[PDB]
Amino acid sequence: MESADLRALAKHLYDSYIKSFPLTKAKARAILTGKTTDKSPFVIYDMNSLMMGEDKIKEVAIRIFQGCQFRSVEAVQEITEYAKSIPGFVNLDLNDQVTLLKYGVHEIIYTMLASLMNKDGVLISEGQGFMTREFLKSLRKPFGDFMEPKFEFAVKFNALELDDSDLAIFIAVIILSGDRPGLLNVKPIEDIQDNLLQALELQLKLNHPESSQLFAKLLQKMTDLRQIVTEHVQLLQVIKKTETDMSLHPLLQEIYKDLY
Ligand SMILES: COc1ccc2[nH]cc(CCC(=O)O)c2c1
Numbered sequence: 001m002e003s004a005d006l007r008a009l010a011k012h013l014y015d016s017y018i019k020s021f022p023l024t025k026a027k028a029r030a031i032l033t034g035k036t037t038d039k040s041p042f043v044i045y046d047m048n049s050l051m052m053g054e055d056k057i058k059e060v061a062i063r064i065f066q067g068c069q070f071r072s073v074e075a076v077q078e079i080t081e082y083a084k085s086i087p088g089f090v091n092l093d094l095n096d097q098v099t100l101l102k103y104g105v106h107e108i109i110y111t112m113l114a115s116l117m118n119k120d121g122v123l124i125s126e127g128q129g130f131m132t133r134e135f136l137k138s139l140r141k142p143f144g145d146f147m148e149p150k151f152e153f154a155v156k157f158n159a160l161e162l163d164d165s166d167l168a169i170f171i172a173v174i175i176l177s178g179d180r181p182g183l184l185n186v187k188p189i190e191d192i193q194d195n196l197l198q199a200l201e202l203q204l205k206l207n208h209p210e211s212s213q214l215f216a217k218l219l220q221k222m223t224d225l226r227q228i229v230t231e232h233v234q235l236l237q238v239i240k241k242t243e244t245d246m247s248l249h250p251l252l253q254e255i256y257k258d259l260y
Pocket of ligand 1: 069
């Protein structure tokens with residue numbers, strides 16, 4: 001592939017990213033930085049602002065937990081529409097299409113969640129709301145611990161200053177991982193990724209000409225993602241055993257089942 005083919009690849013992906021994901025990083029920043037008559041978010045930071053904010057969105061710790069859970073489900077669906085647009089993806093063995101999605105979605109979710117965070121909190125309900133880090137970090141024991149690692153990652157990730165056109169390619173690379181467990185046919189998957197990587201390399205050099213080794217720095221970020229996944233699964237382990245009256249959405253149950 002030559003540059004003209006990689007630019008066309010990048011352009012294709014940006015396009016579908018826009019079509020698959022209603023709340024982009026660009027909309028998210030414009031809402032966050034008060035750069036807007038894009039009517040600012042309602043801000044939840046305690047149980048009152050929460051109950052009152054519930055005019056446009058069990059115990060509180062749980063209700064918030066359920067919220068993020070349903071949001072994850074919606075995300076999985078969006079991420080799935082996006083993957084189908086990735087050239088070559090729907091031509092792969094079906095069991096593998098499933099494997100890539102099974103392992104790729106959460107790494108993606110936390111990647112994109114970064115887009116909706118600053119050091120102080122996270123956008124919610126399609127940007128209509130904003131929930132502070134401290135309110136979350138404060139939730140009763142186990143639930144207070146869910147979001148904090150995501151914030152730490154987001155603060156370091158957001159430092160990269162990626163824009164949506166950078167992220168469309170990076171997210172595609174994450175999905176087309178040859179090293180996922182149980183993969184039947186690794187080679188066709190690596191040939192695609194290889195193109196995606198070539199494409200990302202060129203996109204970053206062109207979009208961030210001054211940012212040296214951004215590419216390398218970006219790929220290194222993939223390490224922080226797998227750990228976030230790990231800790232998260234361990235937390236769920238705990239809930240399943242402590243809160244026997246609660247349960248995961250079946251789509252999320254299937255993703256987590258026999259995962260790592
Ligand atoms: C405070 O509870 C929280 C916070 C942040 C969260 N991010 C994802 C989930 C649960 C859904 C899933 O595992 O995909 C989650 C729960």
